[PDB]
Design a protein around this nucleic acid. Sequence first.
RNA 1: AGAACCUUACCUGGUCUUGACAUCCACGGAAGUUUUCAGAGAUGAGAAUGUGCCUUCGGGAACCGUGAGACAGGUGCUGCAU
DNA 2: CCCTGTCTGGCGTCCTCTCACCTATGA
DNA 3: TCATATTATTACGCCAGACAGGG
Lengths: 1322, 552
Amino acid sequence: VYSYTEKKRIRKDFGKRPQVLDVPYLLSIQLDSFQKFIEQDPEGQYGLEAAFRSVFPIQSYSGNSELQYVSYRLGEPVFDVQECQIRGVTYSAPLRVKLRLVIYEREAPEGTVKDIKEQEVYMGEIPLMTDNGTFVINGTERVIVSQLHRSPGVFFDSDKGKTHSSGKVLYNARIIPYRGSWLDFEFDPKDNLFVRIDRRRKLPATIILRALNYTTEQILDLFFEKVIFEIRDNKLQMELVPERLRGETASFDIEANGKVYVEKGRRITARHIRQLEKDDVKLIEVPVEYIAGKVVAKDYIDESTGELICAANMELSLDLLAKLSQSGHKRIETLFTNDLDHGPYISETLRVDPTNDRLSALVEIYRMMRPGEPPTREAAESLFENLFFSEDRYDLSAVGRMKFNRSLLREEIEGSGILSKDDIIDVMKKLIDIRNGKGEVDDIDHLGNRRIRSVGEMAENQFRVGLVRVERAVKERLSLGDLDTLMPQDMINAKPISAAVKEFFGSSQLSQFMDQNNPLSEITHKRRISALGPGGLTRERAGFEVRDVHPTHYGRVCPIETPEGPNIGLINSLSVYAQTNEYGFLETPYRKVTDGVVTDEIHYLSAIEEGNYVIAQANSNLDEEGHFVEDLVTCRSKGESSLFSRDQVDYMDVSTQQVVSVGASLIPFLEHDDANRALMGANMQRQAVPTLRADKPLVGTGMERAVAVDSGVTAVAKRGGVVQYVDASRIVIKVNEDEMYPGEAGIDIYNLTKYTRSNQNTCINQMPCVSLGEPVERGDVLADGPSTDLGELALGQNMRVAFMPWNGYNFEDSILVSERVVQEDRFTTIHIQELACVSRDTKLGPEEITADIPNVGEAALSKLDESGIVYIGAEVTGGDILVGKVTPKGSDVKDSSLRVPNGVSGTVIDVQVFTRDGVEKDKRALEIEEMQLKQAKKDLSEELQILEAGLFSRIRAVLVAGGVEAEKLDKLPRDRWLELGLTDEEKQNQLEQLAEQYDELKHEFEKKLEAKRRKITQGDDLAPGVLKIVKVYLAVKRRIQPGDKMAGRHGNKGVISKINPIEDMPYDENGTPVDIVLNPLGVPSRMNIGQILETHLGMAAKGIGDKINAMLKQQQEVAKLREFIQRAYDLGADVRQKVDLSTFSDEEVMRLAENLRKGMPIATPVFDGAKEAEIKELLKLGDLPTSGQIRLYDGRTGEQFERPVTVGYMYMLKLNHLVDDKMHARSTGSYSLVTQQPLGGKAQFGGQRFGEMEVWALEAYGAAYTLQEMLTVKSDDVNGRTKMYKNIVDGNHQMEPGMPESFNVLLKEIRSLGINIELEDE
Amino acid sequence: VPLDGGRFATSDLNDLYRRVINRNNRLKRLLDLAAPDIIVRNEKRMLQEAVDALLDNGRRGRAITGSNKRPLKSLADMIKGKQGRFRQNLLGKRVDYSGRSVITVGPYLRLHQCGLPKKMALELFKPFIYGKLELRGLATTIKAAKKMVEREEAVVWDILDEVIREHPVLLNRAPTLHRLGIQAFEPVLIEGKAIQLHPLVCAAYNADFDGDQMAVHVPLTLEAQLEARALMMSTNNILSPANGEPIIVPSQDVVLGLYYMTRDCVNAKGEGMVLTGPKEAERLYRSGLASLHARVKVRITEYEKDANGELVAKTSLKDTTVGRAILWMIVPKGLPYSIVNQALGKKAISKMLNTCYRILGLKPTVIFADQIMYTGFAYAARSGASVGIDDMVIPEKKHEIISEAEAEVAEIQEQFQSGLVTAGERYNKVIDIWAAANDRVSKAMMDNLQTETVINRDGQEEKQVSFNSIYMMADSGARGSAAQIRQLAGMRGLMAKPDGSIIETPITANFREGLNVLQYFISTHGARKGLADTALKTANSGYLTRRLVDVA
RNA sequence: AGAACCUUACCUGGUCUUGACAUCCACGGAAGUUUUCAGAGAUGAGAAUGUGCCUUCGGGAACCGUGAGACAGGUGCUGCAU
DNA sequence: CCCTGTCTGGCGTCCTCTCACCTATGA
DNA sequence: TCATATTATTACGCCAGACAGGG
């Protein structure tokens, strides 16, 4: 079964693997994020409720008043989106917050407040999101791009080689909070442990332990295990668990139980450890040279004399043993400092530490953090207890606590946001374990360690900044609060929240201007994952590995769609199937594989889960049950693509598109292209201009439908049904009854956006693709947008291309084009330019909008009215006048009248004017006022009458259970109608019900039309300051010409060189010329062989189209057409499509065959595409030669090209790098102010920067005079250039050079220091 | 200066000077009032820091800022840096009488001239046109002439063709690295908006035609016109200054046209007939009685200059082809016939132009470079040398080679399950057998491409080098190598992960067969590393050229 | 390039005064169509028909009627103001 | 007193094109 | 409108060059 615009032109779909999961809605990142930001979500997470439950209730410092929260709301926007783009306002909503002030008496923590007050106060306006994922910030339509940043939680990084210049590795460990202070631990090459906070000075790390109220003995209890020396019969024996001897040299005689176990000299092996554990060896008598290097663990004091023997962490000598042995401390605890495993890093750090107690530790930390200003007990304790341990200024989020517990192998995943003692101690323990050998480092490119911020998270963080500023303001006003004479807007202020949130949505590194020239380009700028932005890395610094593709990108980030240039691999684009995790990570779908049978259930994984499992490949042959048909299958285990068994796998890839994105999965035959040319192909495919006549890629991938629907450029039907099709203004859809609400009778009226300006000066235009009285279903398309054709996606157009050298005109990458391409207007794109004119009151009175243009004669008053301004429409070019806008006293008049820029033509399509309340002459301003005034009422009544007509009929329709008397129901016409009684049995109050409808309709229409006139009757609506505001919309129509840039989908760039006549083209023996000749020499080097298979398969597609065009032109009854269409849709191997063609009612075969006579469209999906034998077999269904190559004659000489050439249909696109936006020349005009050199650019009429390497190139020749005029006369020296212009126009090519002006600018800037630079003797 | 509006966008130095003067006025008033010691110490210290911030901002602790957090630019920051006065306004300047547009080919040109559009030509040559108009007497004042060319009447185009004629222009591609990136041409006017640039000259500019742009500059004075004609003309730059190699070497289409022209096949039309000269060789090719490559005894007259500047004619019968005689009609007098008797790839045509320059000098080498380019384009057009899907011949031996390698990795991993061998020796044995299998697949496809054609002549079969399209694009040296044609037919090797170590499972599928998903992802590792390397390598290359031309 | 009436601007009487000719509101009536007696006639008084284009019904555009004025009107003078 | 980690400054590609956005305060 | 005058983030990679520390 198919929908009704699916039976229009059903694309022949190759593809063997049955898809199990359909493509998700391609704009779901932006929409789900911003729907999380604004939503009334009780339990607080996440959203605006999290912000209000963090900041509220505010209580002042015992001020006995506590403003609390109830509920918030967003009212209607005062401007809908279209008039918002026209006017220039933000597309925002007012944020109505209920606030409840309660005020206490004296001594009321528990006492009832003395008075309350509560109001729906107004703070800020937040910009809402348009239904397509965009904002409208100041008239322009902008997009917030999702950031990719390091997750909160601990990271163990190495930096193995570069420091110390000695090959010794370090190991640092960064505890990155979501909000607050950064804490880093790091080794130094003396093997000492150092802490630093916020990249400040370096403190030896155990001082932070001494800041957490840990004595030295507790620290040594933590990071070291005790070795027990017992004072015994002789020589102070040792408890020895045999694990501690692993891998060391036996220094002494190892004997016990009257038996010599291990002698001196040999290293202790694990067999000797087994001997000591089997022989149960713990207590052995040591020599005195064994204890002479060890370190004591805890303190010991001489008991009788009452003083100290040794401090904790002290190495031992023999006389120290003579001190402690004679006192009476029988147990001696020593620190086991294994040189292999258990290193003495904490102990040597304690030897570096200049502190001894907690208080000096806090004083040293306070002198680190805030220097100069003294370190007192209260100040240092408040500093360190609010560094990490308070809920205000340090907060690992839920993501941070999950990563923090996961990297430390904790059991739980939810905990408190602040740190604790045990967390810092665990980070130090894991860092020490990594130094010892056990456990390993983390990498930063691993996408399980890399979170995504999106629109709702970033706007929520900015909103929380605004709320903490307004709570500091509320704490300010409340302690100065006098009661009861204030209500909660003398306390609260709508200014900082609105200021912060407009600061983010206006001027941020991620709220950026939408690339809008294409449905692809909109939908792939909204799905963008940037590494840049605040808190992330920069373009000009880093690096090599963060610009590189890591094995966790499989199915999360597109490997091949990243922009070439200064930021490669920072501006990654998101994959097709990849959602976003609850915590913000990238989870991608996989198919759960319990046993041999691959189950059709899906299950989402992130990269910290994808490593543990074994995940199959998308294309591994499985037949009729899910069993892998091989006994071994390529999978990947832990980022390593390897071959595993038939029955080990736990997951399989869902579909074979899922590695790449929606820009580079529209490229058919992707798997045959090179990676570089697929990158250049996707990046150019974003840049296509919408042509005037949209044309359906013959070789597509089938993802055109989802991109053209999901990007909101087409008018997808909301509720299904039929159609009324007024359409000149709007599509009117009557709704079928099942999808139709009981009240609100209701028919859907779709607004078509006709010719208007895009963000890239292209033309966004919608055209209805459904006729009158034609069924449509829910989700079906109704109006084709820019670059769409019946709901598909038509960026460029499909043309007949020959691969051959043709007389040098396609030399390096150039492209030689027939005249049949430029006669048919099949690339003639439409550009629209907005031009503003304002008459601001700079000085010496205000400027004026009058045609009475001066000095200039009967060449001003022409394309305008008698009162000034361009008169609309017209064939305006360059140097014309659009808006007469000149002042007197500025015989002292001038010409600021905004004219048409140099080189452009066009037609004035629209003139907008919300000017300084006065623009009118004696009456046009109020003349049109009456026109709109009468317009509103007309439609207002019309619509009511339209429904009235439908209701009147409905009244009679229902008039059967309560008066069906046809001759007794046609009484009053426009007066009343139904007048019958009923009583009970069946409910027929319908008449009464519909009576209310009409009654309310007229009653509401009056009010509806009452406000209409009110709105109509007005000067105009805009902001203040600016006075004369005249915007004129030209529309140039640019065709194609030698110098434009065209390109296919594979990376084959080209500058169209010669626009040949039709005759000189290479025609085949049938007679048709070829349209575009490309060059075969690009194909062996640039290894993008996919354009040839697109060429052959498009040739086969148009072969079927020519065959259907013959069978339908030379008209046959529909049996032969349905037989040939059925053969065309069966065609070859096992596919997914076949068709159910004998259910197309003998007319939907014919409408399909009317829409196929330009070529049968073929879906070649991304990595499961059409094989070559099917291309040959399809070329045999059409009557074309199997090789794909036709013999071609030459249009010049009439004689055959030897060795037959390739002709086919490639889908070639026109990129928006047009040659009459690049052509520029300058002889003489205006310059800058500071310098005497020419200005730069094209919009400024400026000259070429003759840069540094061109000066070196002229020095490389003997061009001393060319360089002398190149930097003195042509550029800078003012006397030289005026003398040169007069010398040229006299006929004397001679320069009088002088000295450059910018060098005298250099002399004054150097001399304006204390520097006396001069110019010496003659 | 104020920007468009009603406020003044003030410079940073005015903030610096205004603060120094505010503080200096405060300090004079405090020394008037006899404030105590600590007040005037803070006041003089704030003046010291204000002066030190004016002169070189930010050399002291954190730099002052006006709007918003960005520091404001001081005098030393008007001197130093990439955007000071030296590197931005004194070494490189913006320049009048200059233009810029997208380039395109135009192969009809001679190599001393380039195409230049009429609109750019009328804008760059406004003063010369004014001077010419004032000389004739058509107008009087300068205004009249500016109205005439603002209207563009019918008489200023003859004025423009009379100011162009012998006046060179400097074409310049935007990343100029060596001196061959600024060359002077003579304009030929173009209906259009794109600079037509002679193709051979493109190999000097590193200019393809994928969207490139070039700037035109006009030598105004008379010494500069003579420097453009006598030093910087494109006929004068035919050897690269880095070495002795010619830089006007024929690049890509023209070597394919020559390699298809001067070649041979074991049977064609007119095999082994005898011809009385190269003129009737071209007459037999055009009328349709012989083929472009058909071996034939001709009678050619080569001029060897064995005396002291005297050209001696020797005429003989060379066993050659038809195409070699047709190309002999274009060779100048002094070169011997054996310069065209071979197959003429790219190295051979480069040494053809080099021997022509060493023997016959400059002017025959310029006119012979043009005739090479014209005949290469013409017979490459007549060749019809396409590229198809059938041209990339898969080796029949490729699948058995892959199965023998799969049996070998199976033996090595069965030893790995039983622990006989070490892990590093296993990884080394797997990389060694996949390198050996890769070389065997490349030799299989290279035999299957280099001698695939086997055509008989009057009897039993006889083999020859193939006329496969991708093989002529590889063997000619036009575009392609062994590695690229290897990756289109044989397996594309063992791609390496970004760790730097190689991956033990190769990409056994070429591009004519489809790559599956994992193989394309490993390929994207290998290609993303290359794009990142070029886009970061170019900065160090440019900074190296800067340090070198400033030490020189 | 045509005075019986008309034309006609002149005389004699009989008459009109926002007017024969226009625009504007206010508000009375659809315009108009037919017919009657007195009078030199201008005009001053009667009998028959119609309600069309559109109304959250304070009403409208064509065409008569009345009053207010703003104005209309002048073949009145100056061809020595033009 | 001669090695030495450690800290501080000083580099980091040319040319071009499009768009938007610009200090608070205040009797 | 017309003078008043500066604060609560961190996440480059060498590579010279100068400086306090210590055998």
